Design a binder for this molecule. Sequence first.
Ligand SMILES: CC(=O)N[C@H]1[C@H]([C@H](O)[C@H](O)CO)OC(C(=O)O)=C[C@@H]1O
Ligand SMILES: OC[C@H]1O[C@@H](O)[C@H](O)[C@@H](O)[C@H]1O
Ligand code: NA
Length: 601
Amino acid sequence: GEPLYTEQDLAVNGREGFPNYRIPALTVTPDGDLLASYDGRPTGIGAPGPNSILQRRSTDGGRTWGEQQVVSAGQTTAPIKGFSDPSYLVDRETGTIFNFHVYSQRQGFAGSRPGTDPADPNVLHANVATSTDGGLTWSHRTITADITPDPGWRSRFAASGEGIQLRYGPHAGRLIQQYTIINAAGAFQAVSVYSDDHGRTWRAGEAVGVGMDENKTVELSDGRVLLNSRDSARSGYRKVAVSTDGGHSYGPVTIDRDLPDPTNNASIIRAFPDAPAGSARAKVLLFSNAASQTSRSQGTIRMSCDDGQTWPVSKVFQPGSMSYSTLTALPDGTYGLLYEPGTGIRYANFNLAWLGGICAPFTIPDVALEPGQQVTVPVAVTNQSGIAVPKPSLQLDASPDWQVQGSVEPLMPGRQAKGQVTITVPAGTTPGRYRVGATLRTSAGNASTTFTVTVGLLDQARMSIADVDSEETAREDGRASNVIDGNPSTFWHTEWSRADAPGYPHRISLDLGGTHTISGLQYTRRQNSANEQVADYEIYTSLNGTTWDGPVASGRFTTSLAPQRAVFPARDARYIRLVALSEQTGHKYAAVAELEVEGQR
Ligand SMILES: CC(=O)N[C@H]1[C@H]([C@H](O)[C@H](O)CO)OC(C(=O)O)=C[C@@H]1O
Ligand SMILES: OC[C@H]1O[C@@H](O)[C@H](O)[C@@H](O)[C@H]1O
Ligand code: NA
């Protein structure tokens, strides 16, 4: 139908009683009012700031909003109290509404100490406010002692946004609110807090993962409970896990590389929460987060039509600053989106037509070629839409100097479809790894994927370390072999945990796995520290590993975070060596995240 996307600020920093507003929670009451909840932060900080939990209501479906009310009032006079980080949870069977949030006194999350006694000021308490009148009035309780079965859990907070009620399985009706805890080793873990008696009693299930943080659960088409987490170890992606016992416990936690995230909250919901179990509609998820890995920006909505296996459809809702966001399904079939644009709290409303997607995830493999060559790669489309598309097309977003064309056969319900992409890379094309975007376009919506075309770079998987002067292995993973694993987050670091480690020069030599015509090397510095950066360098090559030729190139690298090229006339070699002569400001150590070799495979 007709696309819809509108926005309207609900709180602006400096207005209506608070210098700063943060942390959105959004839900729909049983009578169909929208509730938006968020912190007022009189001092601009999270707990233990003397924060209040606030609420505005719309009775006209999101179009207009009432006065800002206090759900739980902070206290800036003694005794100091703060209430922060709200999460709504509606019990749709009894009509009760909950709003989970912290109760701080002297400590926030990081500083909370062990114990569950409400009168202990050094505990970050888990509160819930409860409303039986559609969010007009609230009672308050502290449930910390009910959700702390391990006395080692010295801190917790409900992940702000919106919790769920299971519709399926032996635990249908269960209320589930996600928490993060800090255990006795200082690890951040996720856990589900839940009630099977409509919120009279709450407990914690079993904690899962390390490097966890604010996390969210959603009931999948078969009643499994998918957990999606912010990654406090900052991979640049969401972490995921799944429960088969209604959120009591979760399996292994993995990194989901389909969901970039810059370490920030996010939400995931059923698109059709009333859909019957096992149904095509019950497999549809929407996800909201910041898609940049480096900043809270690029607010993106994604859609999965297969219980979160793939996310074929995505659209930007906020190109600029976008921190926390939380989705809720509205009764008129659109979606509410409450988020942080940097100026407070903002409410967006959109529909599936705006999203403009088709449930047709598809793959194109990565491929490698030389400058001046042409390659065709197969496309495979899994049509999940349940509809036929006679005339699909495939549009590629590559460097304009390349000639790139694609096609794809007619979509049939419940079928795989084949296509092809032909990529021609003019000669002279700068060696590197090039992201190409692909869009499957149809009259019924679009889907996308990407794939990488490697031009003029040798195969790292065939390489190995021939030698290195020095490497730290004891106090971190600085193995020389980290330069060729293709991961920009791992690095070679020269040894530093002993005093008798060497300064510069340092040296790392690669076996290319065979003889290749090569003409360059590309260096990528350590991304997360400044003082082990290679500066003056020489490059050598060799046919046997012992008689080195050169320097074939020499120079001084800069502090750029991007690959830096060192080129030399084409020559046949089985090994290449980088001698790092100096560090940028004369420090003792070298670190390198990646080395690529420019040459023909
Ligand atoms: C309870 C409170 O601390 N929650 C805060 C949360 C938390 O500190 C972090 O997620 C732990 O790693 O951080 C942030 C944030 O914008 O990043 C906002 C929340 O208000
Ligand atoms: O002292 C050497 C160390 O310096 C630290 O700050 C850094 O995290 C380590 O990678 C190592 O370089
Ligand atoms: Na690496």
